[PDB]
Amino acid sequence: MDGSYAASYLPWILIPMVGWLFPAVTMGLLFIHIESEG
Amino acid sequence: MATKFPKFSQDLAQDPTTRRIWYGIATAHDFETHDGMTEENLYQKIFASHFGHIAIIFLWTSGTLFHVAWQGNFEQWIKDPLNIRPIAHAIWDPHFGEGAVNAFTQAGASNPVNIAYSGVYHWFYTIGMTTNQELYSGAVFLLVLASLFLFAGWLHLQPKFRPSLAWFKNAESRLNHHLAGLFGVSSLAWAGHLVHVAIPEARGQHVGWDNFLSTPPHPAGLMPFFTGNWGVYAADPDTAGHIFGTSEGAGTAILTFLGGFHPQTESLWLTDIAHHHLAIAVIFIIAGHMYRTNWGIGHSIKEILNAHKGPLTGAGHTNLYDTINNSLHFQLGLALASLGVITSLVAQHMYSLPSYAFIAQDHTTQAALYTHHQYIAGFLMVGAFAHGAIFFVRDYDPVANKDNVLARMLEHKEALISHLSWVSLFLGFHTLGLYVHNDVVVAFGTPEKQILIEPVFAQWIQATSGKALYGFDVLLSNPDSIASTTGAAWLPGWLDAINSGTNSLFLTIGPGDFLVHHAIALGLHTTALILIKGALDARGSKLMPDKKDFGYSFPCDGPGRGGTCDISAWDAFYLAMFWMLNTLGWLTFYWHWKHLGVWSGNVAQFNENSTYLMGWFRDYLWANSAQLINGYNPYGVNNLSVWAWMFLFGHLVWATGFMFLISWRGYWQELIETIVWAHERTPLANLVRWKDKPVALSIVQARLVGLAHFTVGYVLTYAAFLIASTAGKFG
Amino acid sequence: SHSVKIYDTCIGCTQCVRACPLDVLEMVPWDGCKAAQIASSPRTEDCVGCKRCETACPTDFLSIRVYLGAETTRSMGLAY
Amino acid sequence: IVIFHFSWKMQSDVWGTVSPDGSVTHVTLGNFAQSAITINGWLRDFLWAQAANVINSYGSALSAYGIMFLAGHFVFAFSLMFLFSGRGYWQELIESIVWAHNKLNVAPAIQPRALSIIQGRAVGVAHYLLGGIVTTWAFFLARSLSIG
Amino acid sequence: MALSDTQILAALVVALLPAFLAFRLSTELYK
Amino acid sequence: TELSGQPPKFGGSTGGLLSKANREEKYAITWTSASEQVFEMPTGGAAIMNEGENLLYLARKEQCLALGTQLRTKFKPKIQDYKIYRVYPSGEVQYLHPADGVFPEKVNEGREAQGTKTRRIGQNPEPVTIKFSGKAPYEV
Amino acid sequence: MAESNQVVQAYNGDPFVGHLSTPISDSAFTRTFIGNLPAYRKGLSPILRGLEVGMAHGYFLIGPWTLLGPLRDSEYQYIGGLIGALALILVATAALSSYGLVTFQGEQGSGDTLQTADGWSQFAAGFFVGGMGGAFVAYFLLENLSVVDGIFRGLFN
Ligand code: CLA
Ligand code: CLA
Ligand code: CLA
Ligand code: CLA
Ligand code: CLA
Ligand SMILES: CCCCCCCCCCCCCCCC(=O)OC[C@H](COP(=O)(O)OC[C@@H](O)CO)OC(=O)CCCCCCCCCCCCCCC
Ligand SMILES: CCCCCCCCCCCCCCCC(=O)OC[C@H](COP(=O)(O)OC[C@@H](O)CO)OC(=O)CCCCCCCCCCCCCCC
Ligand SMILES: CC1=C(/C=C/C(C)=C\C=C\C(C)=C\C=C\C=C(C)\C=C\C=C(C)\C=C\C2=C(C)C(=O)CCC2(C)C)C(C)(C)CCC1
Ligand SMILES: CC1=C(/C=C/C(C)=C\C=C\C(C)=C\C=C\C=C(C)\C=C/C=C(C)/C=C/C2=C(C)CCCC2(C)C)C(C)(C)CCC1
Ligand SMILES: CC1=C(/C=C/C(C)=C\C=C\C(C)=C\C=C\C=C(C)\C=C\C=C(C)\C=C\C2=C(C)CCCC2(C)C)C(C)(C)CCC1
Ligand code: SF4
Ligand code: SF4
Ligand SMILES: [Ca+2]
Ligand SMILES: [Ca+2]
Ligand SMILES: [Cl-]
Numbered sequence A: 001m002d003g004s005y006a007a008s009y010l011p012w013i014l015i016p017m018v019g020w021l022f023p024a025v026t027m028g029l030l031f032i033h034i035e036s037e038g
Numbered sequence B: 001m002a003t004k005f006p007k008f009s010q011d012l013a014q015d016p017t018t019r020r021i022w023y024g025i026a027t028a029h030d031f032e033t034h035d036g037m038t039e040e041n042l043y044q045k046i047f048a049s050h051f052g053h054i055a056i057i058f059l060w061t062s063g064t065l066f067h068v069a070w071q072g073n074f075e076q077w078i079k080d081p082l083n084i085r086p087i088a089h090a091i092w093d094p095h096f097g098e099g100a101v102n103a104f105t106q107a108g109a110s111n112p113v114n115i116a117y118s119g120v121y122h123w124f125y126t127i128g129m130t131t132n133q134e135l136y137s138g139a140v141f142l143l144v145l146a147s148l149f150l151f152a153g154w155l156h157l158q159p160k161f162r163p164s165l166a167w168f169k170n171a172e173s174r175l176n177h178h179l180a181g182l183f184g185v186s187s188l189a190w191a192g193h194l195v196h197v198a199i200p201e202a203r204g205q206h207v208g209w210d211n212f213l214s215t216p217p218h219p220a221g222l223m224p225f226f227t228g229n230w231g232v233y234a235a236d237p238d239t240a241g242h243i244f245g246t247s248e249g250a251g252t253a254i255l256t257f258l259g260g261f262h263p264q265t266e267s268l269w270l271t272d273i274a275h276h277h278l279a280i281a282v283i284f285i286i287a288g289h290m291y292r293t294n295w296g297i298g299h300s301i302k303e304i305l306n307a308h309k310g311p312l313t314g315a316g317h318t319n320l321y322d323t324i325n326n327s328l329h330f331q332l333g334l335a336l337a338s339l340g341v342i343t344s345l346v347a348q349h350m351y352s353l354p355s356y357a358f359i360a361q362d363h364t365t366q367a368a369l370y371t372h373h374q375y376i377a378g379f380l381m382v383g384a385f386a387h388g389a390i391f392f393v394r395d396y397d398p399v400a401n402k403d404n405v406l407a408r409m410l411e412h413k414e415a416l417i418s419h420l421s422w423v424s425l426f427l428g429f430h431t432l433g434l435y436v437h438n439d440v441v442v443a444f445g446t447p448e449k450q451i452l453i454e455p456v457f458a459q460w461i462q463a464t465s466g467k468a469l470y471g472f473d474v475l476l477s478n479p480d481s482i483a484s485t486t487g488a489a490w491l492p493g494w495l496d497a498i499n500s501g502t503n504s505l506f507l508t509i510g511p512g513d514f515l516v517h518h519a520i521a522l523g524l525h526t527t528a529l530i531l532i533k534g535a536l537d538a539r540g541s542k543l544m545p546d547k548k549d550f551g552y553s554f555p556c557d558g559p560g561r562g563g564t565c566d567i568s569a570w571d572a573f574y575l576a577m578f579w580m581l582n583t584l585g586w587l588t589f590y591w592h593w594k595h596l597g598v599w600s601g602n603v604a605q606f607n608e609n610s611t612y613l614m615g616w617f618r619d620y621l622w623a624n625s626a627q628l629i630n631g632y633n634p635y636g637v638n639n640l641s642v643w644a645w646m647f648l649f650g651h652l653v654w655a656t657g658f659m660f661l662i663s664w665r666g667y668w669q670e671l672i673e674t675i676v677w678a679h680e681r682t683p684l685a686n687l688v689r690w691k692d693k694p695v696a697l698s699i700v701q702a703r704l705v706g707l708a709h710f711t712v713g714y715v716l717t718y719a720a721f722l723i724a725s726t727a728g729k730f731g
Numbered sequence C: 001s002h003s004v005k006i007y008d009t010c011i012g013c014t015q016c017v018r019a020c021p022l023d024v025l026e027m028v029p030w031d032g033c034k035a036a037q038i039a040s041s042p043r044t045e046d047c048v049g050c051k052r053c054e055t056a057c058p059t060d061f062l063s064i065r066v067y068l069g070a071e072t073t074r075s076m077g078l079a080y
Numbered sequence D: 001i002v003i004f005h006f007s008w009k010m011q012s013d014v015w016g017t018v019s020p021d022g023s024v025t026h027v028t029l030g031n032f033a034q035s036a037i038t039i040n041g042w043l044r045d046f047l048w049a050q051a052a053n054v055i056n057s058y059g060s061a062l063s064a065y066g067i068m069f070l071a072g073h074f075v076f077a078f079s080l081m082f083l084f085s086g087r088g089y090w091q092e093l094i095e096s097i098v099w100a101h102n103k104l105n106v107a108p109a110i111q112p113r114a115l116s117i118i119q120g121r122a123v124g125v126a127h128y129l130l131g132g133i134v135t136t137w138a139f140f141l142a143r144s145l146s147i148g
Numbered sequence E: 001m002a003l004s005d006t007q008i009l010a011a012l013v014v015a016l017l018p019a020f021l022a023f024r025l026s027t028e029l030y031k
Numbered sequence F: 001t002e003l004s005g006q007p008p009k010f011g012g013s014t015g016g017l018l019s020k021a022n023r024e025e026k027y028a029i030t031w032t033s034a035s036e037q038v039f040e041m042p043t044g045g046a047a048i049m050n051e052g053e054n055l056l057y058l059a060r061k062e063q064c065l066a067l068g069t070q071l072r073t074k075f076k077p078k079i080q081d082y083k084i085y086r087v088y089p090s091g092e093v094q095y096l097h098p099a100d101g102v103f104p105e106k107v108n109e110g111r112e113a114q115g116t117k118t119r120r121i122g123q124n125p126e127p128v129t130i131k132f133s134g135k136a137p138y139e140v
Numbered sequence G: 001m002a003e004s005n006q007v008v009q010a011y012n013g014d015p016f017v018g019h020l021s022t023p024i025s026d027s028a029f030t031r032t033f034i035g036n037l038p039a040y041r042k043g044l045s046p047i048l049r050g051l052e053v054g055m056a057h058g059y060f061l062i063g064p065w066t067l068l069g070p071l072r073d074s075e076y077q078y079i080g081g082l083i084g085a086l087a088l089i090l091v092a093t094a095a096l097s098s099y100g101l102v103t104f105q106g107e108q109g110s111g112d113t114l115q116t117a118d119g120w121s122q123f124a125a126g127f128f129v130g131g132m133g134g135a136f137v138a139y140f141l142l143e144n145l146s147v148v149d150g151i152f153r154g155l156f157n
Helices: A009-034 B019-026 B039-071 B074-079 B098-104 B120-127 B132-155 B171-202 B223-227 B270-287 B301-307 B320-325 B328-352 B363-394 B405-411 B413-443 B456-464 B491-498 B511-536 B569-599 B603-609 B613-628 B641-662 B666-680 B699-729 C015-019 D002-013 D039-050 D063-084 D087-103 D117-145 E005-030 F061-073 G028-034 G046-060 G063-068 G077-103 G117-143 G145-152
Strands: B087-090 B113-115 C003-006 C026-029 C037-040 C064-067 D016-018 D024-026 F026-033 F037-040 F046-049 F052-058 F083-087 F093-097
Touching (some): B039 B087, B039 B120, B039 B132, B074 B120, B132 E005, B171 B270, B171 B301, B320 B328, B363 B511, B363 B569, B413 D087, B456 B511, B569 B603, B569 B699, B569 D063, B613 B641, B613 D063, B641 B699, C003 C037, D002 D117, D063 D117, G063 G077, G117 G145
Antiparallel strands (some): F026 F052, F037 F046
């Protein structure tokens, strides 16, 4: 994996963020919201 | 007690099972059933939702533009469009190995990349965009456009700017502003863009934001438009030797009408396109002055509809203004039917009469475009009929529409359904019989007894447009005909493009095209029969004379009265989806096989083997798969690895849909009960307990999920086959 | 829960009560048919929705109708 | 899956010819080891490859196998209609057709009823099994009769 | 040319604006 | 009050009560038997009812009602004196079946009429006439 | 009275409390964001809150000395940053614990568990462990940056 296009360091950390951090956060928030009050 | 989600349905919020989750996702957009919904709040929420959707479309377009600019080879693609393949964007996947990296460093890229297949490169080029910075500024501006529409949607939900119900129900003014302003002014602005930018850039004249005020697109200004001598603008059109992007063969014309195809790019002339847009702009602005608003002068839709009474019909179209204006499912069904028809129309007109430069040579992109838009049209048609049935279930008023066209359509629904049944049985019986006869005839080593029947009517129609291959000499195929000697500037180019067997305009048809058009007729007739029978019985039948009391979508009515599985109109939609997918499969199979033959010059294969179905089984499906299924093998990986993997992915998803479709709930609820027993009695896991009681998917949910997997698999596997075959063969 | 309605086309043959597996229905006195009785749905919170009462109904189209509503532990038939 | 395994393994690592050297040349050249480990291998080097005998069987004594191949495919697709739908839609369609026959007084005394739910299931599974098994019957017979 | 390094990480700040406005529109439509 | 009766002779099974009986609710069937008999368990397998009073706890009401139908339809001296109650985790007991000491199959005085529509089936109001309300044709 | 377009209202409906409800001080986003930080997230015991806060803080406290401390231009740049971060987290733990020792001598309240002697000591313990671990794990990432890069680029496939 590499990239002659500019700012090739951006996908480096942006692919894990879109694939791991963002989904985990959204799924956790939606899970807490689904199971709220009781 | 209450579990909060979903806030819009206490009947769901008090569900202590996992269904509460699923249904919460399934009924969120059905605003009409939200607790305490009012019509005015319904309309206002729909308005804001529309704003959000427009912002989403603008963001997706900005993504296309930005990724093409950033990770594409647009400027390199312009240097040699016929050889350089356009790239959509770069790949960045840590799962990749050396083989995959080497395979996907393609089209002269220094890194793994996917090649574009949507013809957006040809679009942007024919439009006049020539650098990366232009695409970039376009993406940023579209970001701003999405921002504007998002703020508008936020503002229209505030008590200080909430449009009222009477404003939403103003049909006359809305039709005026859409016909005249939304449609007409926009085609006017697109004509102006083509005149100022697209055509000058096609001739090598750079027109940007830094010079468009200084350089007029015509040697004469607006006085020839002001005075009336409009032929000045036809001047010297682009010669038949104009090379695109240069000044060779270039002229000064900004509005022509020579018809035919550009000899190099093989697309419509940009001058004729801008001329078309100008004429259509004038027509739409004229249309947008029909209905009165606040100046007394004009028409009212209600009086026009009321006036159209009659003898045999009865009430005619009386009160239909209120009928359509008070039901949003009626408006949505009308819109969906119209938009699906015209989306199929776009699909039929883009492969035959292309309008983007050099896109006729890019065969994969054209195949993918035709397939995509025909699938969109099929979805839109199914949705239109679903919303018609939903209108019948929720909004239909029998007293305000008594004896009118609607009530009569319902009053003889048995005749309509039975005659659709007859035409469908007719078509299917005889087309399948002819195909099986041809198969059995070719099989026994006697291919001479095939029933080949010439598509005479459609060949005659082609000839009426100037097609002289079949020797019909009728209308525009006959030079001695009145219609052919009128002095229309579009006749020479049209005849030259329709009588040169080198493009995709009015393709020569044999008996196989006849058979497959009858198959298409069967598909349409049967899908429409499903949808119409569902919409007309949606209010009731002889099994459920009160089916309207249960709603548009319900599981059933039980095993009693003989059994009532798939009774609701929603079940008719779900049934019709299968036949719609089959109809689009027949469409795309026909299109792709005939076009592969056309592109390879070996039309003999399709013309001689499309008559028996084994021809389709071995010469189309089996053959064109050979490349795809070798995208990866025991020997390595080529550029079709993703397409082969996605082919198998679609197969898997399709079969998984079969899973939900064949096996029905109760078995699964019992199985889940045993698994619940297991969990409650296994130590350590007893530390943990579910918040929602696990339950099997519901009946309607199971139909929806099986159909969702079926459709996902259908689309993905056929897209993989289309792309891989047409790209490994290069047409 | 589910709604179980009874209409005036009731003939009072008591078959739907006999067919009910969760004791949702009762036979109350009436004066609209020969049997001088009509069906009722007092214990609807125990209705699961198996449509047996409709299956055992003789009138030309049922006089007793079951409409599936908000699901709960009792309506979903859960033993857990 | 059992019979597909049997066919491919026999043709790959067992069945074949033997030249006067002790050396054995198998039918499909031992491709089981490197190809039967992925699903793409079963799709390409087993189904796509070995169905070439069945599809090109027209014009020979095995054209009947291609005919029955297509016939089993058709019967599977036909079963799908009984497997994916419900009785109520068909009973409503039959009601409309019964009205149409009432229009011309061709109404049969034996009232047409849609297949019962259980019967719909039985018909669907019967046609499914028939179509699939006949498909693989034609495929296996043509293949194993066109390998010498 | 090729897009500037500084240019790619300039569109993201502009994208922060439709992100904020979509967040606002979602939260308002939830009401 | 306090439910009385001897538990049926049963060796145990995996189909009986779960966590719901103690977290949510449970049900009870009592019945008198003319002799030690063998009956089928709604949760699977055979059990032996004692002569005299029998008390049995079940997870769902339909299970108790299935046992009642079996008692009243499958034995030579028909057992029809069975009673079905609902027990809550607080120990509260709610008598259920038969509601008024008489089976609901046969008419009995004192019973009100609920869910009874004065109109016909085909006389329900059209949905469009009640739209944007929280009601359905069978509710107004 | 069709005039409440104002976004800055009285804080918590009390105009005489020294605060103003503003899009930063009391908006839905800031409220749901700060309120769900480990310091305020409901359903969290003090030691878990301290663990999370320490993880974050010790992780980011590696950088300053790593890139700017005196060992930045030595062969022990990452080790020097790590040592500085560990000493800083130790001093901060001492400060946290001293604060807890002095503020909770009297009667233990019943509001929230964090605002007690036991709760604050648990928070300090969690902070110490989380901070030492976060500093060591950011150090370990920096020292093994090549394997991280090879992983995120698929170089080892
Ligand atoms: C819907 C539009 C769209 C789509 C489908 C994609 C697609 C993709 N992008 Mg891109 N991107 C877009 C717009 C889009 N982009 C815009 C407008 C910008 C400039 C602000 C960028 C800048 C960007 C960068 C810097 C990178 C990508 C990258 C990627 C790839 C991985 C996603 C990622 O990691 O970045 C996440 C994307 C962003 C942080 C930008 C936000 C996207 C827009 C502004 C919002 C889209 C909202 C839209 C409604 C979708 C919502 C979901 C939907 C269900 C409602 C992926 C194929 C990576 C890549 O190059 O792959 C190799 C990467 O390095 N994008
Ligand atoms: C001239 C004034 C005007 C204009 C500019 C608009 C504009 C618009 N209104 Mg509005 N409105 C107005 C006045 C106006 N309105 C009035 C007077 C009323 C009544 C009082 C309304 C009430 C109203 C309501 C209630 C709604 C709208 C909606 C809309 C939007 C329609 C949906 C859409 O975005 O698709 C755009 C459609 C087109 C551009 C037309 C395309 C032509 C067809 C599809 C064929 C395509 C041709 C061509 C080949 C396509 C190019 C392909 C390309 C890829 C190459 C649109 C932008 C809807 C909305 O979205 O809310 C925001 C909506 O719900 N209007
Ligand atoms: C190859 C698969 C297949 C076949 C053959 C059929 C067949 C048929 N479907 Mg169907 N459908 C299918 C798939 C299929 N479907 C699937 C997967 C679904 C989704 C569940 C549907 C859902 C569906 C719906 C909702 C409807 C139909 C309808 C119809 C009938 C319309 C008449 C027609 O099309 O022309 C003529 C018939 C044919 C081409 C097939 C029969 C031809 C045979 C070979 C004739 C020979 C009979 C044979 C000799 C009998 C003796 C056999 C003996 C050896 C035992 C027809 C009989 C529509 C209908 O009923 O129209 C009134 C209808 O509304 N289908
Ligand atoms: C003068 C002040 C100052 C200084 C000099 C530094 C200096 C530094 N910081 Mg710091 N920082 C500061 C203040 C400062 N920071 C402040 C005030 C904050 C906010 C509180 C931060 C927060 C911050 C974070 C969050 C990070 C840094 C990091 C770094 C280092 C990045 C340079 C590098 O080595 O490349 C290399 C950079 C990387 C390899 C990035 C790490 C990528 C990992 C794998 C994350 C992947 C994302 C994804 C979600 C994976 C999660 C997996 C999960 C799902 C299991 C560097 C030495 C990074 C670091 O410590 O390096 C490890 C880093 O992660 N800083
Ligand atoms: C009066 C005594 C004194 C001493 C001896 C030092 C000495 C030092 N100073 Mg400091 N300084 C002081 C006062 C002092 N200073 C004052 C009063 C100020 C305010 C003006 C400053 C402001 C100043 C700044 C701004 C900085 C220094 C820095 C440094 C260090 C530079 C080298 C290094 O890499 O550190 C690394 C060593 C440590 C951080 C201490 C760790 C020592 C051990 C190994 C800790 C391990 C914990 C261990 C488990 C404890 C066990 C306890 C047990 C024995 C009971 C150095 C050790 C720089 C620095 O911190 O370098 C990173 C720096 O940035 N000084
Ligand atoms: C080409 C399609 C291939 C086959 C599809 C099926 C065709 C259906 C024909 C069956 C006979 C219809 C029986 C009519 C029953 C009938 O006669 O109703 C009675 C009706 C009398 O109408 P009135 O005089 O009251 O008209 C006043 C109106 O304003 C109120 O309706 O007759 C007509 O409307 C005129 C001719 C019927 C027109 C029927 C339209 C059928 C569609 C045909 C294709 C439309 C193409 C439109 C393109 C612009
Ligand atoms: C510029 C955009 C601004 C958004 C912030 C962006 C990054 C910052 C993330 C911080 C989030 C804060 C977390 C605490 C927030 C938090 O925990 O709130 C609290 C709440 C549960 O906690 P409680 O109700 O107990 O807390 C209430 C009080 O304590 C509030 O302080 O969680 C939720 O409300 C559910 C979350 C909403 C679910 C949103 C649905 C998202 C799904 C759709 C996503 C669409 C993506 C499309 C594009 C791909
Ligand atoms: C003073 C004034 C006049 C002078 C006006 C002048 C002096 C200039 C007028 C300029 C106009 C009216 C410009 C209209 C511009 C619209 C533009 C530029 C673009 C719209 C693009 C959209 C909506 C989306 C585009 C997309 C993007 C961005 C892409 O990059 C790919 C294609 C696509 C996806 C379509 C005259 C005398 C005349 C009349 C009297 C008043
Ligand atoms: C159910 C329902 C619904 C729906 C419906 C639908 C869905 C329908 C359909 C459909 C369709 C979708 C149709 C279409 C059609 C067609 C037409 C209308 C035709 C046209 C024609 C013409 C006349 C042409 C002509 C021409 C030619 C031939 C060629 C050349 C050119 C010209 C122009 C000359 C609604 C909601 C509404 C209401 C309720 C119920
Ligand atoms: C989000 C956001 C933001 C931002 C922020 C920032 C700028 C930052 C942060 C960042 C950070 C701050 C991060 C972090 C990280 C951390 C980590 C990752 C950790 C860790 C740890 C671990 C992993 C462990 C360890 C250990 C232990 C403890 C045990 C033993 C030893 C060891 C070492 C193993 C803001 C607010 C603006 C806005 C909104 C959104
Ligand atoms: S089965 Fe029908 S007719 Fe008989 S008592 Fe019950 S509701 Fe009345
Ligand atoms: S649906 Fe079942 S439980 Fe409900 S009243 Fe009818 S028979 Fe009784
Ligand atoms: Ca330019
Ligand atoms: Ca130093
Ligand atoms: Cl493989």
